[PDB]
Design a protein around this ligand. Structure first.
Ligand SMILES: *[C@@H]1O[C@H](CO)[C@@H](O)[C@H](O)[C@H]1NC(C)=O
Ligand SMILES: *[C@@H]1O[C@H](CO)[C@@H](O)[C@H](O)[C@H]1NC(C)=O
Ligand SMILES: *[C@@H]1O[C@H](CO)[C@@H](O)[C@H](O)[C@H]1NC(C)=O
Length: 312
């Protein structure tokens, strides 16, 4: 019900980043790519954005300054092209939590090199979005901002000038903790991330929101009937104040009455405040979820029949 009131409505595709113990890992054992048929169904239903998750170390092995692995990049491009050739947006998401081979990415120059490399492969695709990194955590707030800034600079330096760059905060880029959670340097996302600059002026602030008590997305129990919209409120104020726009890049509820009402209430809030929220992206689709309580993968997603119409 809630899509044509949003610039971007769609689903995460999760699976190509799985099994991160094993890098490079092996297709079919540790990770997989996406089901173009299922993505095609979502597109023909009216969804227009897919957040394609991947692992940095598989796309660019050894060092962040190295060349790409052509087979992994090949499959990324195949899934991206299926989506963008049909007019939907493909967001490229390194699902790495600010960490490269386990270690916090401390070098902004390594990060800019990585992003200049990945962006060069897609610089002429106007339907591609770049997502600097999924859910920075346990780091200094200033380094996370500086890493995000290094990514924008890398992306534009490669000549990828038409694409929106999704910048993510520290502390799992949670919306509800945007003004409160502090990094190891004592600074919040509100305190560090407003400074980000882009010569092409296409920065989308990329936040996540879950509805259980600790916001982990771990429990099928949603706090209460309005916990979704209420947790967006502080971040919405912040966005209007500093004249920024955002997208809710991850969200989900379980299949129960309270989670359902809380999810639609949140998506209603986003429509009410579409001056700063450009849309929302469900977590998650992808073929290797089985009975995962948030899986909206059409053929076996337990959340699909319930929340696919809500998104739509
Ligand atoms: C791919 O997606 C289609 C549409 O949802 C589904 O019917 C099919 O079973 C899926 N294939 C695999 C291998 O999961
Ligand atoms: C890419 O996808 C093909 C299936 O089309 C698979 O055979 C291959 O192993 C995959 N390779 C990588 C690196 O993902
Ligand atoms: C749900 O819990 C939050 C957390 O305190 C609270 O702010 C909100 O008002 C609650 N909603 C209802 C309907 O009780």
């Amino acid at each position: 019900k809630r899509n044509k009131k949003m610039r971007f409505a769609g689903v995460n595709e999760s699976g190509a980043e799985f099994g991160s113990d094993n890098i490079p890992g092996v297709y079919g054992t540790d990770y997989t790519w996406y089901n173009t048929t299922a993505m095609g169904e979502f597109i023909s239903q009216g969804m227009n954005i897919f957040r394609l998750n991947l692992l940095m170390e598989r796309l660019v092995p050894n060092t962040m300054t190295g060349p790409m692995n052509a087979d992994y990049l090949g499959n990324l491009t195949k899934d991206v092209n299926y989506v963008t050739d049909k007019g939907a947006y493909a967001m490229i998401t390194p699902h790495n939590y600010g960490r490269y081979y386990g270690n916090i990415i401390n070098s902004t120059s390594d990060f800019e090199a990585f992003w200049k490399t990945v962006a060069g492969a897609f610089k002429d695709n106007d339907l591609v979005m770049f997502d600097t990194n999924n859910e920075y955590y346990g780091m200094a707030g200033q380094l996370v901002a500086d890493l995000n800034q290094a990514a924008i600079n890398g992306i534009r330096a490669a000549g990828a000038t038409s694409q929106y760059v999704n910048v993510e905060g520290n502390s799992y880029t949670g919306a509800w903790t945007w003004t409160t959670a502090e990094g190891t340097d004592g600074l919040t996302n509100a305190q560090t991330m407003g400074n980000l600059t882009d010569p092409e002026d296409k920065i989308l602030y990329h936040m996540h929101q879950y509805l259980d008590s600790d916001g982990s997305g771990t429990s099928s129990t949603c706090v209460n009937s309005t916990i979704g919209a209420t947790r967006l409120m502080d971040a919405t104020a912040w966005l209007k104040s500093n004249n920024k726009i955002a997208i809710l890049g991850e969200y989900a509820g379980a299949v129960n009455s309270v989670c359902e009402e809380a999810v639609e209430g949140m998506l209603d809030y986003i429509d009410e405040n579409s001056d700063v929220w450009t849309g929302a992206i469900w977590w998650a689709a992808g073929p290797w979820w089985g009975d995962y309580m948030f899986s909206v993968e059409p053929d076996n997603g337990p959340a699909y029949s319930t929340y696919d119409p809500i998104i739509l």
